[PDB]
Symmetry: D3
Subunit: 29 residues, 6 copies
């Protein structure tokens, strides 16, 4: 279940990377 912990942080990172793109897109206005 550390494998399971690791997979869950992998998804967190993917979600924060999209949030970064999103805010910058807003900031490009």
């Amino acid at each position: 279940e550390l494998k399971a912990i690791a997979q869950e942080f992998k998804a967190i990172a993917k979600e924060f990377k999209a949030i970064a793109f999103e805010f910058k897109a807003i900031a490009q206005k």
Copy 2:
């Protein structure tokens, strides 16, 4: 994009909720 920011943070909260339960199970033997 604000609408997209919201669903991403909702998905993050979910992942952190699942992580907590996990660690609670490693701590509980």
Copy 3:
């Protein structure tokens, strides 16, 4: 010692849930 970590991630999830709710009411114009 992992218990304290478990509780702290539980509190983090509580906070991201509220952030999501806030950006949604913001995106609601």
Copy 4:
């Protein structure tokens, strides 16, 4: 409405600071 978001990220930082402190005392064997 951004104030509530500001306070919530402030509480999140407080929690990750404690998590870091905990894994360090764990890594201290």
Copy 5:
């Protein structure tokens, strides 16, 4: 690796602390 986990969470707490101040400045005009 536990030692590396700790410094990463310390770096995360720092980033979230800076985000909070930022949002506090957008909210404060």
Copy 6:
């Protein structure tokens, strides 16, 4: 300073991606 918010989430994502590698590395034991 939304550009600045975005850059800070970019770094958060980078830190959580390393944490994922780290835990899995531990789990591979």
